[PDB]
Write a protein that holds these residues in place. Structure first.
Motif, PDB file in Angstrom:
ATOM      1  N   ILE A 158       0.992  -1.565   0.177  1.00  0.00           N
ATOM      2  CA  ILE A 158      -0.259   0.377  -0.087  1.00  0.00           C
ATOM      3  C   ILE A 158       0.802   1.252   0.036  1.00  0.00           C
ATOM      4  O   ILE A 158       2.254   1.266   0.938  1.00  0.00           O
ATOM      5  N   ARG A 193       2.901   4.786   0.966  1.00  0.00           N
ATOM      6  CA  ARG A 193       2.824   5.106   2.154  1.00  0.00           C
ATOM      7  C   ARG A 193       2.705   6.455   2.055  1.00  0.00           C
ATOM      8  O   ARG A 193       2.807   7.094   3.250  1.00  0.00           O
ATOM      9  N   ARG A 216      -8.421   5.130   3.703  1.00  0.00           N
ATOM     10  CA  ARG A 216      -8.987   3.751   3.820  1.00  0.00           C
ATOM     11  C   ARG A 216      -8.446   3.468   5.472  1.00  0.00           C
ATOM     12  O   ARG A 216      -7.656   4.842   6.249  1.00  0.00           O
ATOM     13  N   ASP A 257      -5.314   5.286   7.473  1.00  0.00           N
ATOM     14  CA  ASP A 257      -4.869   6.253   7.537  1.00  0.00           C
ATOM     15  C   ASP A 257      -4.915   7.736   8.212  1.00  0.00           C
ATOM     16  O   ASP A 257      -5.860   7.899   8.820  1.00  0.00           O
ATOM     17  N   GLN A 281      -1.922  10.119   4.423  1.00  0.00           N
ATOM     18  CA  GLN A 281      -1.055   9.282   4.724  1.00  0.00           C
ATOM     19  C   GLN A 281      -1.367   7.752   5.556  1.00  0.00           C
ATOM     20  O   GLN A 281      -1.928   8.182   6.700  1.00  0.00           O
ATOM     21  N   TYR A 282      -0.952   6.912   4.627  1.00  0.00           N
ATOM     22  CA  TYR A 282      -1.314   5.686   5.273  1.00  0.00           C
ATOM     23  C   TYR A 282      -0.454   5.474   5.795  1.00  0.00           C
ATOM     24  O   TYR A 282       1.160   5.022   5.953  1.00  0.00           O
ATOM     25  N   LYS A 283      -0.614   5.088   7.753  1.00  0.00           N
ATOM     26  CA  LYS A 283       0.347   4.643   8.674  1.00  0.00           C
ATOM     27  C   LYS A 283      -0.165   4.056   9.126  1.00  0.00           C
ATOM     28  O   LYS A 283      -0.913   3.966  10.923  1.00  0.00           O
ATOM     29  N   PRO A 284      -0.682   2.782   9.179  1.00  0.00           N
ATOM     30  CA  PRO A 284      -0.745   1.660  10.210  1.00  0.00           C
ATOM     31  C   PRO A 284      -0.390   0.976  11.189  1.00  0.00           C
ATOM     32  O   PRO A 284      -1.291   0.722  11.974  1.00  0.00           O
ATOM     33  N   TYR A 344      -1.342   3.751  14.202  1.00  0.00           N
ATOM     34  CA  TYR A 344      -2.955   3.349  14.059  1.00  0.00           C
ATOM     35  C   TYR A 344      -3.004   2.246  15.092  1.00  0.00           C
ATOM     36  O   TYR A 344      -3.991   2.404  15.624  1.00  0.00           O
ATOM     37  N   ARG A 371      -0.739  -4.635   5.475  1.00  0.00           N
ATOM     38  CA  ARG A 371      -2.424  -4.578   6.274  1.00  0.00           C
ATOM     39  C   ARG A 371      -2.992  -4.355   7.214  1.00  0.00           C
ATOM     40  O   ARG A 371      -2.084  -5.394   8.829  1.00  0.00           O
TER      41      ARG A 371
END
Length: 118
Positions: free
Chosen positions: A10, A12, A57, A60, A94-97, A100, A114
């Protein structure tokens, strides 16, 4: 032979997303803290504006809304900004799994990046 999406990384890097307000809202929920430890998307409503954009998503981080920096905003401040953002809302996300996953109980990030919950 099938090329699964779940196996490719995904992105980043930060992205610009434009959301058009529904009858009331933008079709997602956020989580955050009083100290401003980040504003994260925790839930996207099926069929809602955020979903229809197809560009946001769970996990994020919302960096800004209509140019207003929310990196260190509290949940309350962020929620107010989103309400007052008008009918056309420009979001930098910004995707930061990893970050999170520290918010959501029993959650973790797998090798594919994921968010999984047990």
């Amino acid at each position: 032979s099938p090329e699964f999406l779940g196996e490719e990384d995904i992105p980043r890097e930060p992205r610009r997303i434009v959301i058009h307000r529904g009858s009331t809202g933008l079709g997602f929920n956020i989580v955050g803290t009083e100290d401003g430890e980040g504003i994260f998307i925790s839930f996207i409503l099926a069929g809602g504006p955020a979903d229809l954009s197809g560009e946001l998503r769970k996990g994020d981080q919302i960096l800004s809304v209509n140019g207003v920096d929310l990196r260190n905003a509290s949940h309350e401040q962020a929620a107010i900004a989103l309400k007052n953002a008008g009918q056309t809302v420009t979001i930098i996300a910004q995707y930061k799994p990893e970050e999170y996953s520290r918010f959501e109980a029993n959650s973790r990030v797998d090798s594919s990046g994921r968010i999984v919950t047990d």
